[PDB]
Amino acid sequence: IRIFRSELQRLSHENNVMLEKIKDNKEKIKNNRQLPYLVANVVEV
C-alpha cells in the first residue's frame, strides 16, 4: 500500500522531469516560430 503510492507519485515527478524536457523543446519551437514568415500556395497535400 505505502510502496505502491510511492512509485507512481515518484514516477510522476520523473514525468515532470520529462515535462521539463518538452517545455525546453516548446521554447525552441517558440524560437522556431517567429512572426516574419512568408506565405506560399500549397498545391497538393
Add this chain to the structure above:
Amino acid sequence: APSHLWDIMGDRQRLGEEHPLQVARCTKIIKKYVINLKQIAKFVVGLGERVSPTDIEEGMRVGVDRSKYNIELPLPPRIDPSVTMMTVEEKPDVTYSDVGGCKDQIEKLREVVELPLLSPER
C-alpha cells in the same frame, strides 16, 4: 552650397539601416498583420518599436524591412495615383473682379460655394 551641412549627419541616418524599407500594403488585421509585397508576396508581421497599434489600418501602404520583415513607419495610402498629382494648382490668375459686369451668375455661385466655406455657421 550646403555641402557640409548634411554629410555630418551621414554617419547616423545613412550608414545605419533604417530607411531602406520595402513598400507594401496590409490586407487583414488580426488583433498578426497580413501584408502583400509589391512583388506579389505575402507574409505576417507584428508591431514595431515606435509603431502604434492604432496607426496600422486596412488598405494602407506599410513599409517593411527587406531582410527581416517588420513594420517600422507607415506610409500614405494610394501611391499609384500619378497624373492627378499635377492637377493641384496654387494662386490662380483671374481674380473675383475680372468678370465683366455684375450679374446673377456671380451672386448665385458665391452663396452656394464661397459662402459655406468662408461662413460655415451662417
